Design a protein around this ligand. Structure first.
Ligand code: PCW
Ligand code: PCW
Ligand code: PCW
Ligand code: P5S
Ligand code: P5S
Ligand code: LPE
Ligand code: LPE
Ligand code: LPE
Ligand code: LPE
Ligand code: LPE
Ligand SMILES: *[C@@H]1O[C@H](CO)[C@@H](O[C@@H]2O[C@H](CO)[C@@H](O)[C@H](O)[C@H]2NC(C)=O)[C@H](O)[C@H]1NC(C)=O
Ligand SMILES: *[C@@H]1O[C@H](CO)[C@@H](O[C@@H]2O[C@H](CO)[C@@H](O)[C@H](O)[C@H]2NC(C)=O)[C@H](O)[C@H]1NC(C)=O
Ligand code: CLR
Ligand code: CLR
Ligand code: CLR
Ligand code: 95T
Ligand code: NAG
Ligand code: NAG
Length: 1122
């Protein structure tokens, strides 16, 4: 009973609070290495004493064996043991010593009241991801085998110099580096692969591009590359390398892999989480006279406040780098006036509403803190003193929340991540801290002793390392943003490869899982808790006839297609120009005749009140205005040329003709109104973050570079430190005071900078400029302001993660309301596509297998008996698995003997499968073909026999066509692997869901293709002379239709859109030459920053909208199937 009395006063939320404080202080202490001498010991001694209290505490609570029953108590026991060991003769400097200690940070779960239940939900969510994980592994293995077959040994191709006049290789293979980087150039010997400069031949080398880690030469390397593609981490770089070493047509491959693997799977995972989280939740005297007037705070007074806030915001949003002294003084005067006005409010209110009651409110204390900080800066007014708190006023914009229902929704989602859903945030913080400390402890010293290998050519250290806690946390955060493989390559070259693999993969997977469970949890909990009349009749007859509609559709298709031949090289084709010219004239005449027919049949009112006959009228007008200009002598006048660039809108006349595009456009139009309001809410938040960024980084991104021949180098600080020294040292006419293209020089360009940091493309350069910043007219210095990274870490958490949770919630609510209004009708689907969907519904549910009769003849019956059993199917399935393992061991440059043995094994396998097909056809006569999987096997067997015979015919025996054709012929063995889908019920259900969702995906992809075609035509007209820099290169440019479509497909996933915006943002020397010897567009290789920022930003927004609509379609299909 004594132990019971001790436990009464030894265990309670006080005891737990003390344990929490002790473990937290232990964590924060173990963050710092070289923790003070003589206390490195004293603290672990204190924390050792923590442990005796915890053991004696059990003794007063549980029993030696009952205590252990709980899984969490063993961790505590491990903690008590290690401690005692280290007191005497335990290795002092082994990596393991504190990695065992860092679990002690994970001990918070057992002491924080409600984390354990949340963790169990996480294991449940993991347990529901089984079938999707199996499908993902199968798909990645299949695509890795395909990639191995097609692209093995290609990324080892490099431009090697020729010889002048022979033992082995004549001197090291002198390569050439592609302009702007130090990486060696990759090429190919194909027609659409890539060409070397003069005096350079394509040769296969021994090394892979990045760090000998980017390859398709083995199943492991191909699997890693396909996992990278599925995660879409720098997938555009691999895309470009593969198309440069193999050919442009192979882009088709990638296309199929960024849709199946990278898109369809991301959506199963989402659904599998969503459904599961839902399952878990659906489971659960004169003072009095002043008071008379002080409480005169009527309706007008609150309006005055809102107007003052708005005017303060619009004055703070007009500061820039080039502010004049009078304008600068105007802003300071306005800020002082507003500050004294807000001080006046609070002093008037508080002395009206007694202080006690005034503080009792929650907006009032917010007002108080804002105004106190404002006055604090008003007192200590230095030029640059706490610029972040100079922007602190901006939070007054949240005052508008009380009347703006969507801002209140953002503020509730923000507050829910620390309230009802605080446990997920706590676990995320613990995971980030634990992996950061583990990475620092295991791979800290290697990063410092081997830095030369992973550092930039002119730098003396890597930009992302693990020597200290801050940089390890930055690496973990960047992994949580989807960028992991480059730092993984960097760490494999500096430390242990196995540790890198395990650490990076575990961090990525287990952090993305918790980030999704918080995103979905926030979404759910927040949001969802006379003769003229006769001829008119005749014309009416003419218009609604089917042949006329077909003719008009064919004319529109031809008009759209003819635009794809007006490219950079049309001036070199003399006859094509005239042919296209006459074709355009006749098409314009035809469409004018159509418009007159619709004006004489439909009637003017009907015509001008249909919104699909206005978009046709407008296009006909544009064309007529152009044609009249061309027949006259005003074709080169600048307004008219701009009107002519509007000929890329001609493909928009196909929307009204085809019904699927029409219905999907109607669905988008029905969603636009709410998208507008959420967009306004986001703009006001990102203005608070853009005004903050302008306060921090205005005019501080200017550098001096040494530009010689297409490569620039930052001038070292030992020679140049100021803009003034930069001019005096420009002796060779080769130093230039340049600026970062995407800077924070004003609020307008700050919006572009935050778009690159939110989409995570181009954010890296913006951050590096910010973290090297110094005062204006001073050369940037390496990480002078390292703690500026945090600023970008707070934008991504609040600006991006929480303003996408708002957008997705609003979209889901709108979609649900629209469905319900359409009586829960399948949107994105045409009427006959609904019949197709009903037929697909009926197929999947018919269980009857109607076994087939037994053949009368004895031998046929015997074959029937030996075929129908389940042992036959199991044996064939394990044979297919053996064949898959046999194809997994193919490696580039292996041996002749291995190739011969593998070929003989393939011959044996195809013979075995042909014998089973013959036996099945001899046992099952017509019934065999009645089934749909037997036809598939039959097709696979025929394709394999055809592959063998055609390879045998087309080998040395006959015409030796390009060897790469053989590589395509042996792609017929993957069907044997695809025959394994027959047994896997989960895979066969997920693929059925995909088949069910295909019909609407077709229409949405039709809109995506139309959008890509229109933008290609604009880009091809506007950006075809820009100098090759960054993304734009001799293969991915805007000089032809295929080159433009490659870039637009690449940036459809927003990948590398900053790399294509970079060359268009050039407006002069040293990057662009104005008055270039021979270019007619702007006389030069410069770009159009304004047209470029509208093109690349509008495209990504529209693409995101289309993708999220596809996401909704696929997720609802998955829910319906399950
Ligand atoms: C930079 C932008 C960073 C954060 C945005 C903060 C928005 C602040 C809104 C204050 C609203 C408020 O003041 O009042 C709202 C109501 C009061 O009304 P009531 O219902 O309580 O009565 O409160 C509520 O309901 C909702 C309570 C919502 C609490 C949201 C803030 C939680 C933490 C914010 C900062 C996190 C660290 C940021 C570090 C930056 C450096
Ligand atoms: C893989 C790529 C494409 C395949 C897409 C297949 C989509 C259509 C399949 C679903 C379907 O619409 O099914 C149609 C029906 C299913 O009726 P059921 O018999 O199940 O009804 C049972 C009742 N009962 C037995 C009494 C009749 O009939 C059928 O199955 C006929 C289905 C025949 C499908 C042949 C597809 C061959 C295409 C490509 C093969 C590529 C191999 C090489 C790959 C190289 C690497 C790229
Ligand atoms: C490009 C876009 C898509 C390409 C692939 C899309 C088509 C995938 C077809 C898979 C398939 O149609 O199978 C599933 C059906 C399911 O039937 P269940 O009885 O399980 O009902 C399921 C029970 N419930 C109602 C609960 C679901 O099976 C059947 O209809 C049996 C009849 C069909 C037999 C030939 C079809 C399979 C041929 C090729 C499939 C290969 C797909 C490769 C995908 C990429 C892998 C890397
Ligand atoms: C809930 C938590 C879940 C956690 C899940 C993720 C766990 C990941 C574990 C991965 C373990 C990897 C073990 C093998 C690594 C050690 C062997 C190794 O040397 O690796 C490096 C290899 C390449 O080596 P190298 O350059 O030729 O130099 C070799 C030389 N002998 C040397 O040591 O210097 O490099 C390779 O062998 C390439 C391996 C690619 C593997 C791709 C895995 C994809 C991840 C799974 C995706 C589906 C999910
Ligand atoms: C929240 C959810 C996402 C919101 C995303 C918002 C993205 C908006 C980007 C706006 C960028 C505006 C911008 O960058 O202006 C700046 C450009 C730069 O021109 P410059 O000649 O090089 O002069 C440089 C000098 N520093 C100067 O501006 O003085 O000055 C220009 O010449 C460009 C002027 C026109 C820019 C219009 C942009 C419209 C984008 C439409 C986006 C919504 C689409 C739907
Ligand atoms: C998924 C599997 C399919 C992915 C895309 C597979 C893409 O392969 C495209 C084929 O057209 C390749 O062309 P060939 O190999 O026929 O051309 C070579 C002949 N010359 C031109 C060199 C002489
Ligand atoms: C769907 C409606 C929108 C698209 C309307 C139909 O567009 C089809 C075009 O893509 C056809 O290809 P091109 O004419 O671009 O290919 C020829 C390219 N060269 C070889 C002449 C340069
Ligand atoms: C750079 C220049 C900008 C590029 C322009 C891009 C424009 C995108 C094209 C969108 C055009 C908008 C077309 C809008 C389609 C709807 C046009 C719809 O009106 C036609 C009707 O037949 C179909 O609509 P409903 O009849 O269902 O609606 C009946 C109206 N009440 C009576 C129910 C209210
Ligand atoms: C109020 C307190 C808030 C504390 C943090 C509340 C929880 O927010 C943490 C998440 O934003 C972390 O996600 P990441 O920013 O690492 O992921 C990148 C964002 N994407 C990938 C989703 C766009
Ligand atoms: C981006 C994603 C692209 C996925 C591209 C998916 O393509 C699959 C389509 O071929 C399936 O289309 P349906 O069989 O539903 O055809 C019915 C439509 N018509 C032809 C009858 C009008
Ligand atoms: C630009 O930077 C350089 C280097 O910091 C400045 O030169 C120094 O100026 C101080 C006086 O402020 C002298 O005491 C040092 O001896 C100077 N060091 C030298 C010669 O490098 C230079 O004056 C600055 N120019 C400006 C103001 O733009
Ligand atoms: C260094 O000198 C070079 C050449 O003397 C300067 O390059 C000039 O740049 C201006 C505009 O910035 C152009 O109008 C000239 O055509 C360029 N001249 C040549 C010959 O290229 C460069 O601006 C100087 N850098 C600094 C900032 O001192
Ligand atoms: C303004 C130019 C550039 C585009 C022209 C768009 C305007 C005139 C077009 C687009 C859609 C058309 C409308 C579609 C809806 C209707 C149908 C009927 O209920 C009355 C007129 C009204 C409201 C039409 C008036 C004109 C209209 C709004
Ligand atoms: C079963 C799971 C873990 C996947 C493993 C399948 C095996 C067959 C795959 C995975 C990686 C593949 C290896 C990748 C690279 C090589 C190097 C070569 O010198 C022998 C073949 C070999 C060793 C391949 C053998 C087959 C391989 C081991
Ligand atoms: C009860 C049912 C209707 C609830 C369904 C909730 C679904 C629709 C929610 C939960 C998680 C959400 C997804 C979370 C992440 C993304 C990625 C983004 O790039 C497109 C939107 C998309 C795909 C969201 C779409 C809506 C979504 C799938
Ligand atoms: C080929 O089929 C498609 C694949 C995708 N795939 C994606 O993987 C993806 C990831 C991130 C984004 C994305 C992120 C941010 C912005 Cl602003 C825009 C886009 O897209 C998207 C499609 O939509 C058109 C179509
Ligand atoms: C390219 O062709 C040259 C001969 O012109 C040959 O020597 C070289 O090896 C070829 N490379 C490849 C990979 O085809
Ligand atoms: C820049 O390039 C030139 C050669 O073109 C070189 O002479 C100069 O020294 C380089 N930069 C520095 C460090 O001054």
């Amino acid at each position: 009973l004594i132990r019971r009395t001790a436990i009464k006063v030894s265990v309670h939320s006080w005891f737990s609070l003390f344990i929490t404080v002790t473990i937290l202080v232990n964590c924060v202490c173990m963050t710092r290495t070289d923790l003070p001498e003589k206390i490195e010991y004293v603290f672990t001694v204190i924390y050792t004493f923590e442990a005796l209290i915890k053991i004696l505490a059990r003794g007063f609570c549980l029993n030696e064996f009952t205590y252990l029953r709980d899984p969490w108590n063993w961790l505590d026991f491990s903690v008590i043991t290690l401690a005692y060991v280290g007191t005497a003769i335990d290795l002092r400097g082994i990596s393991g010593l504190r990695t065992f200690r860092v679990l002690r940070a994970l001990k918070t779960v057992s002491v924080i009241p409600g984390l354990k239940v949340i963790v169990g939900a996480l294991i449940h969510s993991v347990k529901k991801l089984a079938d999707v994980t199996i499908l993902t592994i199968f798909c990645l293995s299949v695509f890795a085998l395909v990639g191995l077959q097609l692209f093995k040994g290609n990324l080892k191709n490099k431009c090697v110099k020729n010889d002048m006049a022979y033992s082995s290789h004549r001197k090291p293979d002198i390569y050439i580096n592609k302009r702007g980087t130090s990486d060696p150039l990759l090429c190919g010997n194909g027609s659409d692969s890539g060409h070397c400069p003069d005096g350079y031949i394509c040769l296969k080398t021994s090394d892979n591009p990045d760090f000998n880690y980017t390859s398709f030469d083995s199943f492991a390397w191909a699997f890693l590359s396909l996992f990278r593609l599925m995660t879409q981490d720098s997938w555009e770089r691999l895309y470009q390398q593969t198309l440069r070493t193999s050919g442009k047509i192979y882009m088709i491959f990638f296309v199929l892999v960024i849709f199946l693997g990278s898109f369809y799977l991301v959506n199963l995972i989402l659904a599998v989480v969503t459904m599961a989280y839902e399952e878990q939740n659906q489971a659960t005297w004169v003072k009095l006279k002043t008071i008379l007037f002080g409480l005169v705070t009527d309706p007008f007074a609150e309006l005055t406040i809102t107007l003052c806030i708005v005017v303060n915001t619009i004055f703070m949003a007009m500061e820039h780098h080039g502010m004049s002294p009078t304008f600068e003084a105007m802003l300071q005067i306005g800020n002082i006036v507003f500050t004294i006005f807000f001080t006046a409010e609070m002093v008037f209110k508080i002395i009206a509403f007694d202080p006690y009651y005034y503080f009792q409110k929650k907006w009032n204390i917010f007002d108080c803190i804002i105004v106190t900080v404002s006055l604090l800066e008003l007192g200590v007014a230095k030029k640059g003193s706490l610029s972040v708190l100079r922007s602190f006023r901006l939070l007054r914009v949240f005052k508008l929340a009380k009347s703006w229902p969507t801002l209140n929704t953002l503020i509730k989602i923000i507050g829910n991540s620390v309230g009802a859903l605080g446990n997920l945030t706590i676990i995320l913080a613990i995971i980030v801290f634990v992996f950061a400390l583990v990475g620092k402890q295991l791979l800290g010293e290697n990063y410092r002793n081997n830095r030369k290998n992973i550092s930039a050519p002119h730098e003396d250290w890597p930009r992302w390392h693990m020597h200290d806690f801050f940089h390890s946390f930055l690496i973990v955060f960047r992994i949580l943003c989807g960028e992991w493989i480059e730092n993984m390559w960097a760490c494999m070259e500096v430390g242990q490869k196995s540790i890198c693999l395990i650490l990076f993969l575990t961090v990525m997977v287990l952090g993305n899982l918790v980030v999704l469970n918080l995103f979905i949890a926030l979404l759910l909990n927040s949001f969802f808790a006379d003769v003229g009349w006769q001829v008119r009749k005749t014309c009416y007859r003419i218009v609604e006839h089917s042949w006329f509609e077909s003719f008009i559709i064919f004319m529109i298709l031809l008009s759209s297609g003819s635009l794809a031949f007006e490219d950079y090289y049309l001036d070199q084709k003399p006859t094509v120009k005239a042919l296209l010219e006459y074709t355009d004239r006749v098409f314009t005449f035809i469409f004018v005749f159509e418009m007159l027919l619709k004006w004489v049949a439909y009637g003017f009112k009907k015509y001008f009140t249909n919104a699909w006959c206005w978009l046709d009228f407008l296009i006909v007008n544009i064309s007529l205005i152009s044609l009249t200009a061309k027949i006259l002598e005003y074709s080169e006048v600048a307004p008219i040329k701009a009107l002519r660039t509007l000929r890329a809108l001609r493909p928009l006349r196909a929307l009204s003709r085809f019904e699927g595009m029409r219905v999907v456009v109607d669905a988008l139009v029905g969603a636009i109104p709410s998208i507008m309001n959420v967009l306004l809410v986001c703009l006001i938040f990102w203005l608070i973050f853009s005004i903050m960024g302008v306060n921090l980084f205005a005019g501080k991104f200017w550098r001096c570079i040494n530009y010689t021949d297409g490569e620039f180098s930052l001038v070292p600080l030992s020679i140049v430190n100021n803009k003034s020294d930069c001019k005096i040292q420009n002796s060779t006419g080769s130093f230039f005071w340049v600026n970062v293209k995407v800077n924070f020089d004003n609020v307008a360009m700050g919006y572009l900078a935050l778009l690159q940091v939110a989409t995570f493309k181009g954010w890296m350069d913006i951050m590096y400029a910010a973290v090297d910043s110094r005062e204006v007219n001073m050369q940037p210095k390496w990480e002078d302001n390292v703690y500026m990274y945090l600023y970008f870490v707070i934008f991504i958490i609040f600006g991006g993660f929480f303003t996408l949770n708002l957008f997705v919630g609003v979209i889901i609510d709108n979609f649900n309301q629209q469905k319900k209004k359409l009586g829960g009708q399948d949107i994105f689907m045409t009427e006959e596509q609904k019949k197709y969907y009903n037929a697909m519904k009926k197929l999947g549910s018919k269980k009857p297998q109607k076994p087939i009769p037994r053949p009368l003849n004895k031998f046929q019956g015997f074959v029937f008996d030996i075929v129908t059993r389940q042992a036959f199917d199991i044996t064939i399935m394990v044979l297919i698995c053996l064949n898959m393992i046999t194809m997994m061991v193919e490696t580039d440059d292996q041996s002749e003997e291995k190739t011969k043995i593998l070929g003989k094994i393939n011959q044996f396998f195809v013979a075995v499968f042909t014998g089973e097909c013959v036996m099945k056809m001899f046992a099952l006569r017509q019934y065999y073909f009645t089934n749909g999987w037997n036809v598939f096997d039959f097709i696979v067997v025929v394709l394999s026999i055809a592959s063998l015979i055609f390879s045998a015919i087309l080998k040395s025996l006959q015409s030796y066509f390009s060897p790469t054709l053989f590589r395509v012929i042996r792609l017929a063995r993957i069907g044997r692997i695809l025959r394994l889908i027959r047994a896997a019920k989960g895979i066969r259900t997920l693929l059925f869901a995909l088949m069910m969702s295909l019909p609407a995906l077709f229409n949405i992809g039709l809109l995506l293709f139309l959008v890509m075609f229109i933008y290609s035509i604009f880009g091809m007209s506007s950006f075809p002379h820009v100098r090759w820099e960054a993304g734009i290169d001799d293969m991915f440019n805007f000089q032809t239709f295929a080159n433009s479509m490659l870039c637009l497909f690449q940036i459809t996933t927003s990948a590398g859109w900053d790399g294509l915006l970079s060359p268009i943002l050039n407006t002069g020397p040293p990057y662009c030459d104005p008055n270039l010897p021979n270019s007619n567009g702007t006389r030069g290789d410069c770009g159009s920053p304004a047209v470029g920022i509208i093109f690349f930003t509008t495209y990504i927004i529209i693409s995101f909208l289309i993708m999220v609509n596809m996401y909704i379609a696929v997720i609802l299909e998955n829910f319906n199937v399950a």
